[PDB]
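This entry is listed below:
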Amino acid sequence: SDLWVQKMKTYFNRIDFDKDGAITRMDFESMAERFAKESEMKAEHAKVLMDSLTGVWDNFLTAVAGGKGIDETTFINSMKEMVKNPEAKSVVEGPLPLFFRAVDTNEDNNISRDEYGIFFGMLGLDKTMAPASFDAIDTNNDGLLSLEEFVIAGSDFFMNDGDSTNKVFWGPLV
């Protein structure tokens, strides 16, 4: 699947923030303190950010190699075969509820268009690209991203191997 290797390589290249070459506890802890310090956000968020980022690795990404980090080969080999099972969903969908409270830079429990744009700026992207994913995630039509919207759009990007508007949940395709 061409669509699967393009969208899952998008997520691997955008989530390896620490640059060691593998998705491990180092990327989540390095991303929490570097995300809190590099852009304009509510100062207090570093403890909230370190708690949801340590929870995403400890409770969900950790179950892939039973403790140790994950390379691009092991991520594509393990996740491409595990998605063919209709009930393995929660090991791949589980990071969306804890990532929602990590991107919430204003301290409200709803993410806006320029907040999602500062998240894109930290990965190394332009704010003009953020509307293509933001407007595709806003299911209820409020002009903000709620918890239900973020989990529906991420569930489609991570498990449905089709095209449509929710195929860009992480910016430009690698």
The first helix runs from residue 2 to 15. The chain has one domain: 1-174. Residues 85 and 159 are 10 Å apart (CA to CA). Residues 1-174 form a domain with the Recoverin; domain 1 fold (CATH 1.10.238.10).
